[PDB]
Amino acid sequence: ATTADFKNGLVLKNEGKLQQIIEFQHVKPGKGPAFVRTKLKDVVTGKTIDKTWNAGVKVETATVDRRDVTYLYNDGTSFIVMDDKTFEQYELSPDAFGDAGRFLLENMRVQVSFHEGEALFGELPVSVDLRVEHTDPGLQGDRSGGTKPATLETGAEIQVPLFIETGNVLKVDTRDGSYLSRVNN
Ligand code: NA
């Protein structure tokens, strides 16, 4: 409706794009009119910009419908994906999950967001369990502290503590590709 309606995660229809408010601030400069600064992220492209607004100016929002979805596979071109409730099978851009698509497994439960029935983007869980394809031998005398590169079953690489071995199943933070913990048998 207006700038007063601004909060983080709110998505605007603006100059032909759909842009999420990542950060906003109402500003009273103490000389002249108030205005708003918004850090905006194109939800599709991921490109972020800084924009300013005349305080109280009309804005137009998009309702984003979030659907619980299962990732099936990569057909060489698209991510193939099934809507959990409807069981409908459709294509997503390989980019639709950002850098975190790095960590998609077959049959991973994900969320996809829509405006007027068109997929905008997908999200993995914050934590996912991925197996180690390869890392250097485990060192239990912590003897090499620090971390070593590990290659996950997806081909994604992360830093892991020295005690990790090939075949270990790790918990991984998808927000920044960081080691969380080792899953036990
Ligand atoms: Na992939």
Same fold, 63-126 and 127-185: yes
d(CA 145, CA 66): 42
Residue 116 Cα, ligand 1 centroid: separation in angstroms? 26
Torsion region of 66: left, alpha or beta (phi above 0 gives left; psi -120 to 50 gives alpha): beta
φ, ψ of residue 154 to 5 degrees: the values are -90, -15
Tell me the technique behind this structure: X-ray
How far apart CA 9 and CA 140 sit, in angstroms, is: 44
Task: Using the mean position of ligand 1's atoms as its centre, give its distance from the Cα of residue 55 in Å.
Answer: 43
Asked if residue 129 lies in contact with residue 171, where contact means CB atoms within 8 angstroms, the answer is yes
Q: How many angstroms is it from 131 CA to the middle of ligand 1? A: 15
Closest CA to 15 of 34, 47, 7: 47
CATH code of the domain made up of 63-126:
2.40.50.140
The token pair at 75 is 């057909």
Domain 127-185 bears CATH identifier 1.10.10.10: no
Distance 110 CA to ligand 1 centre (A): 14
In 3D space, the residue among 46, 49, 47 whose CA is nearest the CA of residue 95 turns out to be 46
Going from N- to C-terminal start, the domains of the chain cover 1-62, 63-126, 127-185
Nearest one of 173, 33, 43 to 98, comparing CA atoms:
43
CATH class of 1-62: mainly beta
